[PDB]
Amino acid sequence: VKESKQKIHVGPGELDDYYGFWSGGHQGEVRVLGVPSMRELMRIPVFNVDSATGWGLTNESRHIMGDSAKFLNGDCHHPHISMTDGKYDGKYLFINDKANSRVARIRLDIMKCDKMITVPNVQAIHGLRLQKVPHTKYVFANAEFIIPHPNDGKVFDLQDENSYTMYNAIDAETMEMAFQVIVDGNLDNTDADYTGRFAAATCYNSEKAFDLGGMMRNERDWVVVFDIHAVEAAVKAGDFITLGDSKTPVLDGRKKDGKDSKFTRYVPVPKNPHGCNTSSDGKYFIAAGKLSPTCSMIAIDKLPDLFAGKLADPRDVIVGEPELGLGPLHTTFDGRGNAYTTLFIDSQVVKWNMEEAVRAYKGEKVNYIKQKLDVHYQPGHLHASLCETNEADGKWLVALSKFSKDRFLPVGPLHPENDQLIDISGDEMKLVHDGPTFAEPHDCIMARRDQIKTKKIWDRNDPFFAPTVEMAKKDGINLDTDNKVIRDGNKVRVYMTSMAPAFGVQEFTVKQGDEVTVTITNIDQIEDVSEGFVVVNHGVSMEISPQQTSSITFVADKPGLHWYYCSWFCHALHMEMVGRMMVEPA
Amino acid sequence: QKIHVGPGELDDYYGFWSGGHQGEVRVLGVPSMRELMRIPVFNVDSATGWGLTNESRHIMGDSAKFLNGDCHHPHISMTDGKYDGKYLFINDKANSRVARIRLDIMKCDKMITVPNVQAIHGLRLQKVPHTKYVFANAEFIIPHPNDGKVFDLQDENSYTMYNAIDAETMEMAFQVIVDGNLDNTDADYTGRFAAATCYNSEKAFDLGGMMRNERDWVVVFDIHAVEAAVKAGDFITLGDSKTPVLDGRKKDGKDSKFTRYVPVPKNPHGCNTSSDGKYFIAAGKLSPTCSMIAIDKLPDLFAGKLADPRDVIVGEPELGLGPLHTTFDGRGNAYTTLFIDSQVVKWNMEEAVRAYKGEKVNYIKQKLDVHYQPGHLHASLCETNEADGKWLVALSKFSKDRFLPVGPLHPENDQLIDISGDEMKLVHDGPTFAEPHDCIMARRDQIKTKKIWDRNDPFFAPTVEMAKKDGINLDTDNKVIRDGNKVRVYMTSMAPAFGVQEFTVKQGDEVTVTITNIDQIEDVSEGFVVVNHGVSMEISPQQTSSITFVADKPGLHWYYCSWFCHALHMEMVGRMMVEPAWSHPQFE
Numbered sequence A: 001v002k003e004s005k006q007k008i009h010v011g012p013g014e015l016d017d018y019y020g021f022w023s024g025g026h027q028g029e030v031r032v033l034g035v036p037s038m039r040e041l042m043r044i045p046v047f048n049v050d051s052a053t054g055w056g057l058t059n060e061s062r063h064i065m066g067d068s069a070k071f072l073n074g075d076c077h078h079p080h081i082s083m084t085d086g087k088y089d090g091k092y093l094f095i096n097d098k099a100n101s102r103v104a105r106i107r108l109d110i111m112k113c114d115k116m117i118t119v120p121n122v123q124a125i126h127g128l129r130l131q132k133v134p135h136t137k138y139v140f141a142n143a144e145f146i147i148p149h150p151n152d153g154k155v156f157d158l159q160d161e162n163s164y165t166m167y168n169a170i171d172a173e174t175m176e177m178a179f180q181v182i183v184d185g186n187l188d189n190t191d192a193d194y195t196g197r198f199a200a201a202t203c204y205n206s207e208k209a210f211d212l213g214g215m216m217r218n219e220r221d222w223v224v225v226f227d228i229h230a231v232e233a234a235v236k237a238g239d240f241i242t243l244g245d246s247k248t249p250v251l252d253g254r255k256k257d258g259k260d261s262k263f264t265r266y267v268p269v270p271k272n273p274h275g276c277n278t279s280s281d282g283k284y285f286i287a288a289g290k291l292s293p294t295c296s297m298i299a300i301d302k303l304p305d306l307f308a309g310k311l312a313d314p315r316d317v318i319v320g321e322p323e324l325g326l327g328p329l330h331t332t333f334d335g336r337g338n339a340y341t342t343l344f345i346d347s348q349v350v351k352w353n354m355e356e357a358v359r360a361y362k363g364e365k366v367n368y369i370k371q372k373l374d375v376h377y378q379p380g381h382l383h384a385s386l387c388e389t390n391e392a393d394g395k396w397l398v399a400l401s402k403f404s405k406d407r408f409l410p411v412g413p414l415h416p417e418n419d420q421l422i423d424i425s426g427d428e429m430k431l432v433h434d435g436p437t438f439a440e441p442h443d444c445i446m447a448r449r450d451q452i453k454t455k456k457i458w459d460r461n462d463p464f465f466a467p468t469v470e471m472a473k474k475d476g477i478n479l480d481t482d483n484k485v486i487r488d489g490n491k492v493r494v495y496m497t498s499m500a501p502a503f504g505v506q507e508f509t510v511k512q513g514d515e516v517t518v519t520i521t522n523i524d525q526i527e528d529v530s531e532g533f534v535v536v537n538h539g540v541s542m543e544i545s546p547q548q549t550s551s552i553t554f555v556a557d558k559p560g561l562h563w564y565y566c567s568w569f570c571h572a573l574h575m576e577m578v579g580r581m582m583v584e585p586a
Numbered sequence B: 001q002k003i004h005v006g007p008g009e010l011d012d013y014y015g016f017w018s019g020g021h022q023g024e025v026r027v028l029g030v031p032s033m034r035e036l037m038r039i040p041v042f043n044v045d046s047a048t049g050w051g052l053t054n055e056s057r058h059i060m061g062d063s064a065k066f067l068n069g070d071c072h073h074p075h076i077s078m079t080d081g082k083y084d085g086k087y088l089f090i091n092d093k094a095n096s097r098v099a100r101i102r103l104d105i106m107k108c109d110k111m112i113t114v115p116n117v118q119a120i121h122g123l124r125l126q127k128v129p130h131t132k133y134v135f136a137n138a139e140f141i142i143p144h145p146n147d148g149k150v151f152d153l154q155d156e157n158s159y160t161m162y163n164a165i166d167a168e169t170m171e172m173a174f175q176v177i178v179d180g181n182l183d184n185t186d187a188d189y190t191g192r193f194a195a196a197t198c199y200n201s202e203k204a205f206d207l208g209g210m211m212r213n214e215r216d217w218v219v220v221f222d223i224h225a226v227e228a229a230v231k232a233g234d235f236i237t238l239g240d241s242k243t244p245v246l247d248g249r250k251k252d253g254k255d256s257k258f259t260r261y262v263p264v265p266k267n268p269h270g271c272n273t274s275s276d277g278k279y280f281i282a283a284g285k286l287s288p289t290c291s292m293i294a295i296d297k298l299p300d301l302f303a304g305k306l307a308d309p310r311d312v313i314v315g316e317p318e319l320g321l322g323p324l325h326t327t328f329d330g331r332g333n334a335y336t337t338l339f340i341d342s343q344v345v346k347w348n349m350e351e352a353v354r355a356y357k358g359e360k361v362n363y364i365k366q367k368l369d370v371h372y373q374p375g376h377l378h379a380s381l382c383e384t385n386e387a388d389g390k391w392l393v394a395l396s397k398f399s400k401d402r403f404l405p406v407g408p409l410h411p412e413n414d415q416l417i418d419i420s421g422d423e424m425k426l427v428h429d430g431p432t433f434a435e436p437h438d439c440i441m442a443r444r445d446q447i448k449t450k451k452i453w454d455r456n457d458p459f460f461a462p463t464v465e466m467a468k469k470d471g472i473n474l475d476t477d478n479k480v481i482r483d484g485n486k487v488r489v490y491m492t493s494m495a496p497a498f499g500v501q502e503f504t505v506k507q508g509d510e511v512t513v514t515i516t517n518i519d520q521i522e523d524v525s526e527g528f529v530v531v532n533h534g535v536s537m538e539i540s541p542q543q544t545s546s547i548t549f550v551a552d553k554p555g556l557h558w559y560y561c562s563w564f565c566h567a568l569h570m571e572m573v574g575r576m577m578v579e580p581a582w583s584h585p586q587f588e
């Protein structure tokens, strides 16, 4: 006997116990929440353009974004935190972009996106998860959509021998591609084991069909299992091809005339399986059945025998297939031996015992279902605290439901997502809070307060603006002290320190048509004194926090006097923290 | 008064938060302080496609080229001094705009770039007899014309202007040249008078100069005189704008017909009309006071019956260090933020007036510590004659240690305070992003929203008229219209299928995709994303939305529905096939 009775109220002056990192959904950012209050503490821009901080306008952010800075949109789903020895290490958060086929890395000490990659030769990065052991060496990313190779407009047939999609491994630390594995069918979600050897992905379109009926044709799709060690061996030996103009090593993980690749095994699993979730004890890849009212449990410790050819049938690694309810989509873990699965149709979370399910699969009459909790309504992902680690603590569960209906005040034709906080600390799940959220966050991840360590003020050597420091060095500028205007043809490079309540350069004059770069270094040492910079009627806006250098470039296409001002309330004299750009005509 | 909204309970109020430097408007439930919706305005929203779609770019006009805004001041339209729930208006200081949000669909439906001005900051609405005008301050003095021949703020043609916009048409109604500059503004409860604070009577550009004068002022506008002069045709126009411009400057110590200047210390900031209609209350900021302007002494002021403009001041209570903003409980108490002392001070307005006449009396009732450095504050219904004295939100600029560390950039702290009693009680710390400066609350029953669009809605009526030139019935048609190097795809959609699931174009073609969501059920929002083309938008029930992009890449390119709509959402996809340029006629 043990009751679910955790406190959910965080009053004024008290602090949350966990960080929550929510996907921004179709809006493209990442959001930091406090748990259990469920309040949003910060927004981290990634694929969106943020007016407030200038992400997508500043030179530092556009440098990180590369050519994809031309896109103003992203579509996020799956946020994950880097691990060492199967425990969160607080270093990085990674997230997908389904719309423009990217992966982004967030540095959790500064809470900013610091690296971004467009995955080559694929369309739509959706499923995403991290290697656990011995650390997050790879980020594993699913490209969802089958395309021709090359995709040059000669062939559109998705059944062509060179039409396929690929599993993607990105080097977590350099954020360069590591390798890609061609697969049969398509990819939905993915997860990794607790050794570094195996990873797995559900596939819903084993039919390689383009119509909805054609995609639900097979009684069984599969989860494809990857022998990452075998892939690495082939890469070290130079046994790969490359595609197009990408140097990324490409391995062929498809079945050929019924013959298995060395890199993959295809395990039959019903049906359009969706979630692919690794239990915190490291025993199982659990695939949610979706169109089948089941989950399929793959025994990770049978995978070595599978790849060695010691098992008679790939179905032999399946050790449980519990029947749970209608529309199972995703699974999470309390660390006590239970799994928690969302039932999209029944609109519930079902708590079930994994080892009891395994015994039932063998024929024992044992009820593995512990409880079903109604949620409101149509849940997709769910997430228990530390569930992706061997420290899963069984304290909090968030279920992310797609249809909020009447759970909040009406706000027009568009509705919020309902992210419901559930106490799982005791024997009985208890619903404690309804959290409305914008643009369908879809999935989220939690970390203990003591697993995250952030900077109070920037380091002057920070790589985030190192390229700007280098520019300054070429101009002979000391960013910590200088207030100078550099003239170079029709290019003007203004450098200034800023400290509330005065810009270090309070006026400058240019010629109509000049290309103006303004570089600002906030030389305050006081935490929380953020500064801003806005050029009126020129589309220019950015943040400069303490000890940060930020820069932005725009053309002075309008003659006359044009004001700039500090946007971040920084001082009692904030309204008066302003300057003048004077633009001479021809 | 219940503080917590449990699962299945609803909030009692809507809150409309300024999005600050991030540029949107946010809808919260009060008292839970949870965000229920985001309404894109000056930001580009990946999720709904605002700033990408043809409908939204049509509304933004030429300013669709800007990806930023800087919001401060949301206000709800009124009839006879009470909110009527029709419209929300908000400022853009960064690119000099005013936007209107329709509160039935919770979208921005109109936007205007205010001509011949820089930086729209202060904004407020006429109260009586209804919101005929939106009043908006341009903060910064500029040359006229601003053609780069003259830069001097002291020149006789350097000035800023007060701006009145027609609330219903969202066209300019008039502009009034002022001395000094303009910070915040409010309006009376008759329709005759509006008022604005000024902090730069010195017309300087450096920090020292802007603080030189012991007093600046609040400028008072006689709107009846302005309208009369417009009907009489006694006005000029500036540049290409047809907006009537009236001159409200002093000339050689003689007042204009349109304005009076009441000296107020010092770099005053907030300008707030008491809910009983009695006072314009100016927050003294660099002066540890507020200045109370007796609205019923204004007619005499404008008729020469008073010797000194200061004679309309009937109170000037000493409150504390750095007064910025004032609000009202409807019980005769005012509440003022003290930025430096980091408090909310509750004070009785009638007793402050008594003390100004020398009657020794302590008008200060309570000082509540807030965390930290508060800017604006808002009490529920404070802008109307129904000010109900229930909730107060103070919007503080430095949250410091009140929330978990999230790196060098901190959230703002918007603190909900219970004022239903004699003692202010702090009940909730609400962190927010990008500095909402201000917010406005409305009772649940003051807001009525639509769940399904009407097919004739003006938001996409331009799109309906485009479709008709192509012979298209948007409610039924799934057609690919070709027109040179332009391709216009029209489709219905209803979960989980697009009505056009594939189409073929030539490389370089300009493709417009128009989708009409013909579902009838509430909350089946659909989406549309073209992979690797920077294309994303929302289509809600009965809405038509459209988006235009160049098919610049040969090959097969998937599109998919982004908004979860169905159990078969994952499979609601389509294919754009782009034939390569080398297989079609070659152009340079």
Ligand code: CUZ
Binding pocket: B072, B073, B121, B184, B269, B270, B324, B325, B375, B376, B437, B438
């Ligand atoms: Cu722009 S100021 Cu006190 Cu309104 Cu926040």
Ligand code: CUA
Binding pocket: A500, A501, A502, A530, A531, A532, A566, A567, A568, A569, A570, A571, A574, A575, A577
């Ligand atoms: Cu510097 Cu506000």
Ligand code: CUA
Binding pocket: B495, B496, B497, B525, B526, B527, B561, B562, B563, B564, B565, B566, B569, B570, B572
């Ligand atoms: Cu239609 Cu998702």
Ligand SMILES: [Ca+2]
Binding pocket: A203, A204, A205, A206, A207, A215, A216, A217, A218, A220, A221, A271, A272
């Ligand atoms: Ca299938």
Ligand SMILES: [Ca+2]
Binding pocket: B199, B200, B201, B202, B209, B210, B211, B212, B213, B215, B216, B266, B267
């Ligand atoms: Ca002054």
Ligand SMILES: [Cl-]
Binding pocket: A189, A190, A274, A275, A276, A277, A330
């Ligand atoms: Cl998953």
Ligand SMILES: [Cl-]
Binding pocket: B184, B185, B269, B270, B271, B272, B325
């Ligand atoms: Cl104000």
Ligand SMILES: [K+]
Binding pocket: A530, A569, B397, B398, B399, B410, B411, B412, B435
């Ligand atoms: K702040």
Ligand code: NA
Binding pocket: A064, A066, A115, A116, A117, A175
């Ligand atoms: Na990169």
Ligand code: NA
Binding pocket: B059, B061, B110, B111, B112, B170
């Ligand atoms: Na307009």
Ligand SMILES: [Zn+2]
Binding pocket: A077, A078, A381, A442, A443
């Ligand atoms: Zn997902």
Ligand SMILES: [Zn+2]
Binding pocket: A274, A275, A329, A330, A380, A381
């Ligand atoms: Zn899912």
